[PDB]
């Protein structure tokens, strides 16, 4: 699977880096959040924490999925801005 960053965007008010990326998986299924996070952090020098994946989406026939990710400066601002359902869905918090 390849991961190709299409856009990065900066937010000073909430203190976040928004990231739009494409995933290329020709012949394979839709990949997993763990793997996508590993690749993202390895490639952009980010913390495995303070990083969440809002969605990975597949289309009708593409073998090319899309993603949206957010990288925060501080775990505190993170837990304050982001709701709990994505945190549980990612694994950064135990319900």
């Amino acid at each position: 699977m390849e991961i190709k960053v299409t856009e990065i965007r900066e937010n000073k008010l909430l203190g976040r880096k928004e990231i739009y990326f494409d995933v290329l998986h020709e012949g394979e299924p839709t990949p997993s959040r763990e793997a996508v996070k590993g690749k993202l952090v390895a490639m952009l020098d980010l913390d495995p924490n303070t990083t969440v994946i809002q969605y990975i989406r597949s289309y009708f026939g593409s073998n090319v999925s899309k993603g949206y990710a957010k990288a925060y400066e501080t775990r505190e601002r993170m837990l304050y801005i982001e709701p709990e359902y994505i945190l549980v869905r990612d694994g950064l918090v135990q319900k």
């Binding site: 937010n11 909430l14 801005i81």
Partner: protein, 241 residues
Amino acid sequence: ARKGPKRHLKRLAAPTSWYIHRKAYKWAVRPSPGPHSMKTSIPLIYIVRDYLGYAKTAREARKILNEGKILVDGRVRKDYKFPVGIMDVVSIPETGEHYRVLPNRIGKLILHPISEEEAKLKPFRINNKRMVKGAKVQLNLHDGSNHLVSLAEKDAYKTSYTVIMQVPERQIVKVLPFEVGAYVFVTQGKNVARKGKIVEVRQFPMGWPDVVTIEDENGELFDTLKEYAFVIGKDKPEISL
């Protein structure tokens, strides 16, 4: 049957001056009473969320608003219902961004980016005059605001002139009159967002408003109403359009 005032607003019934999706949902933010009208203003949350894109939901927008990270006319505004309007200035000092609110040739409101120097001035149109106790003159402006002046200098302020003012402290500079060579910016009607110079005024009897003719720099002439002709300069503009 209705026993009182309204507190909701549906999206199919929202004014046309807005950039909004009408079928995505059923409900819209009803603005609160304030400076401008409903047909001439848009709340702040729509700016924070749908124009600039600093938030995707409304909780995030409320959160940034309740921390003084956004100003309007040099003042902090925490209410997501506050109506923003024409000739107003939106300032984000954490990103160095300054926008001025203006309409299009279509009638919709937009954000024109300006500089920090011009972000400290706001033009006002004198809409009426009154004499109040202490024998003082009260000018009633176009955003619903008011200014006090002495009697000695009453003949210098009339009911269509324009006044430039430092926004937060609200001190006057550079009055501009309504004459036959003044620069103009139309704010409503069929010829909205056009610009040009005045040529002729015309009056009518028994309640009908006054009309004015204007010439654009391509040389073409067009008429409109006198209350729609915002004065912004003498020979050239003082702000950015």
